[PDB]
C-alpha cells in the first residue's frame, strides 16, 4: 500500500510527471506568447 512512500525520492519517471512538466511548459509558453500582444 504505502510502498510508494517508503523512502520517497523525487525521481519523476513514472507516467504522470513525464507528461505534466511538459504540458505545463506549454501553457507557460502560451500565457507568455499568447499574452505578448494582449498587453
Chain contacts with other proteins (rule: CB under 8 A):
1-3, 5-13, 18-19, 22-23, 25-26, 29-31, 33-35, 37-39
Match 502560451 to its residue by C-alpha cell.
30
- CA quadruple 16, 18, 23, 28: dihedral sign: positive
Distance CA 37, CA 21 (A): 25
Beta carbon of residue 2, minimum distance to other proteins (angstroms, whole number) = 5
Amino acid at each position: 500500500p504505502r510502498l510508494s512512500q517508503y523512502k520517497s525520492k523525487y525521481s519523476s519517471l513514472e507516467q504522470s510527471e513525464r507528461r505534466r512538466r511538459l504540458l505545463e511548459l506549454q501553457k507557460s509558453k502560451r500565457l507568455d506568447y499568447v499574452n505578448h500582444a494582449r498587453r
